[PDB]
Structures are given as structure tokens and as C-alpha cells.
Amino acid sequence: LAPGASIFRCRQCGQTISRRDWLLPMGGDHEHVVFNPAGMIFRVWCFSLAQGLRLIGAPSGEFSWFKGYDWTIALCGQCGSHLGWHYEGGSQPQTFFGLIKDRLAEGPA
């Protein structure tokens, strides 16, 4: 009844992005803390599915945090905020999204 933690929206503009129902335990945990070559730390949640994003450029395997996957930058399709990455080219599953937990807002359906 009236769940308040069902949908993830973009924290900057409110664009619909994903659902708690779509969280994916990659390697046995939905949460992965990672850093990029510029040393920036991200708390990443894996989702099977997302919407309202704009995937920019072409996939790269360079420095992928997930063995066997190529990544594309995922922007909020509405406001352009960097929300994470789409992962493709791997196995079980072939694709998923890694989204930056603190750039999303959790709320009712």
C-alpha cells in the first residue's frame, strides 16, 4: 500500500529513470564502489533496466569495472546530468545499467 521507495528519478530534474524492482545483484551485490582514472569515486547501483537516459558515443572496453562488458556514458535524457553507464557485449546478462546512487532520488510510483 502506497510504497514511497518504488521509482528512481533524476535528482536534478525529476526524469523517470528506474525502479527498486529492477535492481540487479551483479557479483552477488547491487552496490559496487569504483573509481575512474581521474580518481573520482562512485557508489554504483546495477539495474537490469532503465529509461529516460541518453547513451552518448560508442561502447569502450577501456578500464571497464565489469569484466567482459563495454560501457557507454548514460546522461539524463532531460537535463544532461551524468547518471552513469550502460554496459553491453557481455554474458548473463548481456546488458545492464550502472547508475550513480547519489544522482537519483527514490520515491512513490
Ligand X SMILES: O=C1CC[C@@H](Nc2ccccc2)C(=O)N1
Annotated binding site for Ca(2+): 29, 31
Closer to Zn ion by Cβ: residue 61 or 80: 80
62 contacts ligand X (rule: CB under 6 A): yes
Sheet of strand 82-88: strand arrangement: 31-35, 41-47, 96-100, 82-88, 70-76, 53-60
What's the closest the beta carbon of residue 16 comes to Zn ion, in angstroms?
10
Q: CB–CB of 107/86 below 8 Å?
A: no
Other C-beta atoms lying within 10 Å of the C-beta of residue 21: 11
Phi, psi torsion values for 24, nearest 5 degrees = -125, 115
Binder among 71, 96, 99, 104 for ligand X (CB under 6 A): 71
Other C-beta atoms lying within 10 Å of the C-beta of residue 39: 6
Q: Which does 26 bind (CB under 5 to 8 A by kind): ligand X, Zn ion, none?
A: none
Phi, psi torsion values for 22, nearest 5 degrees = -100, 5
81 contacts Zn ion (rule: CB under 5 A): yes
73 contacts Zn ion (rule: CB under 5 A): no
Closer to Zn ion by Cβ: residue 73 or 79: 79
Q: Which does 51 bind (CB under 5 to 8 A by kind): ligand X, Zn ion, none?
A: none
- State the binding site for Zn(2+): 10, 13, 76, 79
